[PDB]
Amino acid sequence: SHMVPISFVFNRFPRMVRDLAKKMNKEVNFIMRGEDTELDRTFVEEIGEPLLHLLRNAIDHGIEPKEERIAKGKPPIGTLILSARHEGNNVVIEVEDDGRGIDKEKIIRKAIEKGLIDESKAATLSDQEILNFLFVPGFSTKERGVGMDVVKNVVESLNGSISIESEKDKGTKVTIRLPLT
Amino acid sequence: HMVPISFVFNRFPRMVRDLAKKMNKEVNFIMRGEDTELDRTFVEEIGEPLLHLLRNAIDHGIEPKEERIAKGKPPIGTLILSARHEGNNVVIEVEDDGRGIDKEKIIRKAIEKGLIDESKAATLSDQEILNFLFVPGFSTKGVGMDVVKNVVESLNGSISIESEKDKGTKVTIRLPLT
Ligand SMILES: Nc1ncnc2c1ncn2[C@@H]1O[C@H](COP(=O)(O)OP(=O)(O)O)[C@@H](O)[C@H]1O
Numbered sequence: 001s002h003m004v005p006i007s008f009v010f011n012r013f014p015r016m017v018r019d020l021a022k023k024m025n026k027e028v029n030f031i032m033r034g035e036d037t038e039l040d041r042t043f044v045e046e047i048g049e050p051l052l053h054l055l056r057n058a059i060d061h062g063i064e065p066k067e068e069r070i071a072k073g074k075p076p077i078g079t080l081i082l083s084a085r086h087e088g089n090n091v092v093i094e095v096e097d098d099g100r101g102i103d104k105e106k107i108i109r110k111a112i113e114k115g116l117i118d119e120s121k122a123a124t125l126s127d128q129e130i131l132n133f134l135f136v137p138g139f140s141t142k143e144r145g146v147g148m149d150v151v152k153n154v155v156e157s158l159n160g161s162i163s164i165e166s167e168k169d170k171g172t173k174v175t176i177r178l179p180l181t
Numbered sequence: 182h183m184v185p186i187s188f189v190f191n192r193f194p195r196m197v198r199d200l201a202k203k204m205n206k207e208v209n210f211i212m213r214g215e216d217t218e219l220d221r222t223f224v225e226e227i228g229e230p231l232l233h234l235l236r237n238a239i240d241h242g243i244e245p246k247e248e249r250i251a252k253g254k255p256p257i258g259t260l261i262l263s264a265r266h267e268g269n270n271v272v273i274e275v276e277d278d279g280r281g282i283d284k285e286k287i288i289r290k291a292i293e294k295g296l297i298d299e300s301k302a303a304t305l306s307d308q309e310i311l312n313f314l315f316v317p318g319f320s321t322k323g324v325g326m327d328v329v330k331n332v333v334e335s336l337n338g339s340i341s342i343e344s345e346k347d348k349g350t351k352v353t354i355r356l357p358l359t
Pocket residue numbers: 057058061062063097099100101102103106134139140141142146147148149172
């Protein structure tokens with residue numbers, strides 16, 4: 001319990017999200033909540049890059065170009081929310097966007113290409129089983145490299161847990177639960 | 182080579198009634214979609230697993246008279262066995278309005294087995310907890326949830342579990358159509 005506010009982790013994010021959104025020509029309303037939520041000081045340097053990766057994913061793969069969102073009947077401006085809070089005895093961190101959602105079709109194609117599953121087993125996979133493929137080491141693009149697989153490995157190294165939720169054209173929500181002690 | 186799932190379903194109503202009677206449980210058993218077709222190669226493999234799920238619902242799910250009353254629930258419990266085609270899969274569901282899977286019990290067993298520690302246990306999602314039931318050798322015993330999963334997978338199928346405390350449990354199995 002040598003704690004510090006998660007703001008030490010969150011502070012650099014607004015400017016980075018702003019620049020990233022500009023680089024990929026996306027309109028992003030970035031909201032951070034609960035920056036006062038405290039966490040183990042030893043988590044600060046390990047959780048920073050993983051969270052940044054999730055934010056990048058939201059802006060790059062999630063939030064759609066203004067013209068695409070309109071065709072979908074959604075506001076031109078996309079919304080990306082990073083939040084932290086205390087739940088029970090954990091620090092819960094969420095990264096949520098109202099983007100296009102994870103393309104499960106593509107994940108299955110990747111799973112098959114990487115020999116992680118036979119095509120005959122792909123047809124009956126549940127949504128959660130499909131999304132879980134993102135946590136298999138080596139699944140992310142081969143760039144110290146980033147990727148959801150690395151995010152999960154880091155979260156597990158902190159004795160924590162991670163879950164993903166997503167609905168086509170609705171959005172994506174990643175939740176990380178870290179132990180306080 | 183397709184046959185109606187009634188090939189598998191027909192013996193369940195009598196077996197459910199018999200089970201409920203022996204276990205002193207009041208159960209209204211509802212079977213739906215008996216005409217749903219599935220590959221003939223699945224028939225001799227899915228029978229025992231499904232019966233085990235029905236058995237689980239009656240034994241571990243539906244609570245005894247006094248307990249349901251205490252929870253504000255009708256004395257007669259409900260057990261629904263369903264079959265249908267969804268997407269391009271045969272979907273079979275087993276649902277009860279019983280006590281729900283005891284997630285704390287699982288967590289305690291996980292800690293005892295040394296698979297998880299106290300701190301980690303508190304971070305687990307409900308699906309992660311329920312999932313331990315699929316781990317070979319995790320539970321008792323010789324059909325177990327781990328055996329049900331293996332058989333389903335061997336048919337290139339998938340299985341998932343959903344449960345809410347004191348609400349009930351629902352197990353879904355998806356089998357290939359092609
Ligand atoms: N927020 C999101 N919205 C939509 N798709 C996403 C999101 N996050 C991840 N994805 C999808 O999941 C796949 C994997 O991301 P990741 O594990 O970071 O690997 P990579 O470097 O290969 O993209 C992505 O390539 C993208 O298709």
